[PDB]
């Protein structure tokens with residue numbers, strides 16, 4: 001639960017359930033204008049991913065949360081439209097914050113929103 | 122062919138198609154403050170309904186468009202969450218020209234958006 | 241947090257924040273085919289509503305969660321398109337369950353999903 | 362006027378309008394496995410982009426459509442969450458005829474859906 005700075009929440013709109021065991025890769029745009037592996041995980045039984053980074057580690061930058069939606073759907077036996085879902089944003093530019101990226105998935109569609117709260121600094 | 126100040130567009134998020142043959146019933150709130158039938162139809166092959174009304178019969182007021190989402194997934198043999206999808210809006214043409222009411226459906230969710238324009 | 245059977249979560253897509261102090265009215269379709277007041281609330285600072293009903297009270301039926309979106313937007317100074325958001329579903333027909341109705345709001349749009357988990361019975 | 366096997370539709374959820382003058386850059390994944398520019402344009406007045414390609418140039422493959430969402434809200438002086446919206450899909454016409462890629466935007470969220478059809 002909020003304490004970490006980057007939390008991801010994935011729901012399944014076909015089943016009306018959390019999207020479980022969904023793979024998520026996080027990237028930081030390097031100095032060279034290339035994406036650099038930052039963190040990864042799988043969502044739990046509640047479709048959340050926590051413990052990705054820490055505050056000292058999560059500096060300002062452009063990150064990409066890539067969610068592997070193709071894999072989750074294939075595995076439930078659907079051939080979905082998308083390759084994956086990718087969310088690109090600028091984090092911590094006017095100070096550190098807490099970020100929640102939620103993705104609501106369906107086979108030919110996905111919505112996605114962000115909740116940003118001010119820790120304090 | 123006849124001013125369509127009101128249009129509905131329904132789409133299927135599972136299959137990536139228009140949702141066709143969806144029952145849409147529209148209602149005008151009456152002073153007695155109940156709903157009164159107003160226009161009805163089934164979405165075409167492109168998941169659209171048109172010729173619902175005309176600009177003379179469409180006066181300001183509270184309208185409710187109701188989509189029979191449940192029969193839609195049933196026919197597909199997929200178990201739905203909702204009984205139907207509903208949109209309640211105030212039509213205030215003191216500006217507003219055309220109204221497109223779109224809904225994206227999934228077994229457990231639905232989005233809806235309005236496209237209100239002039240041309 | 242899950243323990244109650246009907247929980248509502250409302251997010252603001254314009255601000256990227258929980259939709260706070262949002263009024264929610266819950267109805268049960270009577271025997272007579274009329275909606276009967278069932279419960280009401282306001283969402284908290286985290287855009288959730290809990291403690292609406294109890295398990296013994298929430299029998300099978302058709303309920304309507306009506307969210308007063310017009311009021312929240314007006315108050316932030318927008319004239320939104322919708323009158324309110326209303327969610328109609330059949331609850332507890334093949335046994336009791338836990339229901340989470342989330343609504344993601346914008347001025348001319350709203351998405352909404354349901355998470356249903358099996359308590360046990 | 363020319364087969365448009367690919368179409369993008371952008372809409373604004375704050376204002377209830379098409380999103381016009383949105384930059385859309387499409388890309389074809391190359392074996393070198395990088396993206397290669399493929400088609401580009403700005404949405405019209407109805408928030409649509411067409412004449413992106415033709416059925417001969419559109420072969421199976423991994424495509425990415427990228428929407429410059431951020432400049433869009435900027436021009437409106439509303440602070441955005443995302444740098445842009447992206448859709449990666451495999452175009453496998455061994456069936457598929459037309460592709461409509463729609464995106465509904467808000468300052469902190471976006472939905473996207475695909476409408477894949479035959480007619």
Ligand SMILES: CC(=O)N[C@@H](Cc1ccc(Oc2cc([N+](=O)[O-])c(O)c([N+](=O)[O-])c2)cc1)C(=O)O
Pocket residue numbers: 109130132139167223224225231232233234370372461462463464465472473474476
């Ligand atoms: C009128 C039209 O262009 N018909 C198109 C497809 C289409 C694009 C966007 C849209 O609107 C819309 C899009 C999304 N979305 O995610 O892209 C969405 O979530 C909603 N919605 O929730 O109501 C509506 C509705 C329909 C077709 O050729 O079938």
Ligand SMILES: CC(=O)N[C@@H](Cc1ccc(Oc2cc([N+](=O)[O-])c(O)c([N+](=O)[O-])c2)cc1)C(=O)O
Pocket residue numbers: 009011100101102103104111112113115230249251258286341342343344350351352353354470
């Ligand atoms: C559990 C949790 O993370 N709480 C978060 C916010 C949050 C994320 C996703 C979500 O689900 C959701 C997401 C979308 N979406 O588009 O991303 C959506 O459209 C809907 N919806 O329509 O109900 C729900 C609901 C709520 C918080 O910090 O309070």
